[PDB]
Amino acid sequence: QWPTFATQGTQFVRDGKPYQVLSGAIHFQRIPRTYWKDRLQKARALGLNTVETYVFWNLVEPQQGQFDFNANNDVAAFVREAAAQGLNVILRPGPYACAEWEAGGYPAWLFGKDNIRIRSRDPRFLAASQSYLDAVAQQVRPLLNHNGGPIIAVQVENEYGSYDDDHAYMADNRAMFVKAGFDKALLFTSDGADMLANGTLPGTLAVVNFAPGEAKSAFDKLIKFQPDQPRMVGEYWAGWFDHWGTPHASTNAKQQTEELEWILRQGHSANLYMFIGGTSFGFMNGANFQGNPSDHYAPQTTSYDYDAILDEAGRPTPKFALMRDVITRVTGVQPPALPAPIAMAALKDAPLRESASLWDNLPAPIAIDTPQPMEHFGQDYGYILYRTTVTGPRKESLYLGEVRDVARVYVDQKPVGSVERRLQQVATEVDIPAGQHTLDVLVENSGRINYGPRMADGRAGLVDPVLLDNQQLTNWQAFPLPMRSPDSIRGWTRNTVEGPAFHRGNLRIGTPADTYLDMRAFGKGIAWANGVNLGRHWNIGPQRALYFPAPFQRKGDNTVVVFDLDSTAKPSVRGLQQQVWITPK
Template identity: 45%
Template sequence: MMMKRIMFAVLGLVLFSGLTAELKAQQAKQLLGVKHTFALGDSTFLLDGKPLQMISGEMHCARIPREYWRDRMKAAKAMGLNTIGTYVFWNAHEPVQGKYDFSGNNDIAEFVRIAGEEGLWVVMRPSPYVCAEWEFGGYPWWLLKDKTLKVRSRDPKFLDAYKKYINELAKELKPLQVTQGGNILMIQIENEYGSYSNDKVYMDINRKLFREAGFDGVLFTCDGAPQMPAGYLPGYLPAVNGLDNVAEVKELIKRHHNDKGPFYIAEWYPGWFDSWGGNKHHVVSALEKAKKLDEVLAAGISINMYMFHGGTTRDFMNGANFDDKQPYLPQTSSYDYDAPLDEAGNPTEKFRIFREVIQKHLPAGTELPAVPAKRKTIAINNIALNSYSPLFGNIGKPVKNDLPLSFEDLDQAYGIVMYRTKLGKNPSGLLKVKQLRDYATVYVNGKRIGVLDRRLKLDSLNLSEIPSDAVLDIMVENNGRVNYGPYLTDNRHGITEYVSLDGVELKGWEMFKFPFTDLKDFKFSSKSPANAPAFYKGTFNLNETGDTYLDMRAFGKGFVFLNGHNLGKYWEIGPTQTTYIPACWLNKGKNELVVFDQLRSGHKNISTLNGPILDQPRVAASIKSEN
């Protein structure tokens, strides 16, 4: 117990009830601007030569509005955490090759600094592969423009792009390492590599790239228990994921680390993510997990909760799972994760139970900050949607090619591509899209005749009674590139091979690009579209703001923009049926909402709720024509 008291005095994390707010702030800022040492002991981490047990929670700056970063850090302190674990998403920081973005919600350095100001250490996981239920596992889509390039390999083209990115990232993060007076304790190289391959030469190249970029502190790897032999790098700390049996954790790490620790669970799962079409919202027992947390902390093992706060995967950045044992499963935009902090940052019962467990393992007399209050919510009834923009009315200049081109060949990252060709005389038979990625609505002469869905291995439908010279449109949406497993290298999107009718390949294609990076070029009018994919726009005024949740149960499939922010995707199949709106993105006064729906039409209004609907799976109403 005396050793723990010394440890927390060094950290400046012991908050006695008599301390003034000013003194508490001074203690917190001791983590920044003061050089500490951080090293691996035989059984524990050593901070300034004294044992440190990291009690950590994972959060990602891209999933949390920048305005709420400090709020979430304060909540972490209130639960008793002393460390934040965080991934860095390469595709968020280099959306276009050679153009880097570390501003706004991508300001990872500021995220780290705020953690330090709030008295929190950071374990940085730039990897650059992250998995994380994030589009392409964090890799930028433009790597796929070269069909021959292989990610997670010794491919020189991949390593060249990787090196340039890591060097740019290092410029942001090097000064924040503990070796240079910052609060980043250690850096992860690669991520669960043993689940993908076992090339130790490639792993050592990762190490060299990080060192050459200027990451001079402790490096580590992490893997699931069965994959650790393939994924660890000899001589570097091998952390374990998904395991919370104390004896097994210690034995496994010692086996791969010269019969010693320290012992670190890099990903401990108090919850889980949801996928579109899943039969439920994942919920994990707080009491069962609290018991395991108690055992782990009592054994002196350091731990990182994945996730402490998930937040929301906005824009088009959700990933997908797919391998030979399971169908393609894109993940929901809500990343609530049944975490201690919910999607909107509110403490849950799991938060309170975990806090009680952690409190037991802190030095006697330690006073944690109060549990944060639930955030204010509002409900907005009947927002009128009275301005419309049909997608077919906004078709621009096409790209023409004999064969269909993928998103990557069209230099498009996300969104939708409309593929158009003209059918011949008396067309009929099986229309088949070979290697559809991922979801398509099919139109003949502007009328929808069905949908195709990679999830369901539905890549074809029968055409009959079709007039000669009919126009065929196949509207293909990227539902999220695979983020985990062996198919990372097979991730090109759109129509990636060919389209055939009655066994004959169709040619002579026009392709219309809809990346939806913004909506400024779409033309709106008061004429409501019938049975067609369209945007529905409305404005509303507020006297007060608060967190709220769009009720999407009357809508089909699409995404939502609010005041210029892409809030993410919705889909009637659930289980998520709401879209979270953070209060900080609402205005007192006028607000603008735009909903795109590719399946249902005729929308006249939409409302918001003061709480989420995360557990309402539904069967899609129909995959046939509405006409």
């Protein structure tokens, strides 16, 4: 039996004794499962006594009614590994996680044709929430603290106060958590310090989330709001995340270390966000679109390095020893040793000598009168092509409206422009020769918005009327391109191909070892290595390589396939022992 965990006045208690929660965020779906134990042992080496993780709904119910808690989705196995390393667990199932993650964690299929309003009291959304909460609770039921397990606390929703203040909606969520059985652990909410009246529920513990430099101010607000309960920072943002096209974050370790010591010397509990951020593999990054008039769509990078205590690859940064020493001073307890370090390896340049045109890799066409977003065709992530026929000679403006999120436009497979809502673009000029010609509008889902008043419109692809000058274009074909396996690619040749195209070759590995796959030869797209979609690459930066951890590798030849929207002059890849950061173009 794990020790009991409760509150008693202004403190937490564990087996009835005063207890200060010392927690770090590790998202188990962002860390290779083989490496869960390593990251948990590093959390213990910092002096932490607790790990905290979200569950991402869109990974564990990828198709409605079809749950998956296998492999890297195995939340119960992650929790058991944490217990095995002597750590309490704080579980945050959402359903909304935020987390700089695709759609804040919401399944793509919620944005389909039924016109469900997410994060609201739409009965379809509430029923879908309950089904998901029941499923997660069944996975972890014996692990909940009142059943004798290590899960000491469970968060209800996430920062709802930054979204709205419908207290009935929050009460509905608490009641769903209770029906699922999560009341066998301490329930709580987290909010920004100015958002507590909006996001909380009387009778349920609140904790506060805040940035470096805000600790004194934010705790003053939490204590005023909730004077008779324990004090905890549910997320101390000890780092920050990146957007494509903006510099890699560099945050102030001295500030964070001194403020952490101040927090802990008050007796307050804390969760460091992130302890390690890891990677949003595949298409699973999020995006911002904030509320000010000068704010626009802003997609996040594949790496979730976060300038965290541990970097993306699990290596301690200088901030690790700084904060470890803080916790050692406060607790008076010498922490356990770090595990043996996990090595990085360099791999020689490997040409990718085969190419395959995207145009030779389309599915059967789907007939539509006007473009529709990808969820209309059952598609969650990746690309979608819209095709129609046009007649020239015309040099006119093609209006696409609010593209979600990047459109490449072609005429007879020759590029004639691009349109990104990131850049406030809604149209491109197109030159159409005399006669009939094929207009192709290829759209990338760059990641559904994960936060803010715009996140409920999670439709990806095209949604607006398409016009050429003042004439609406109708009668199209849609081609969903989720790119679920590279094994299906056809049209392979050793000739040069224009973008958009795939590129393939072997990367020989003697003994598997963590490496960064250098993407500097390429323009923009995604990459598979040994059959794993490692995520996105883009020459505008700041990230320019892709983490390829040892457990995704095999001994000997490893197939690499790289998708590039742009024509690639010299396609090849190499193994680096460090991330490549550049100043955005």
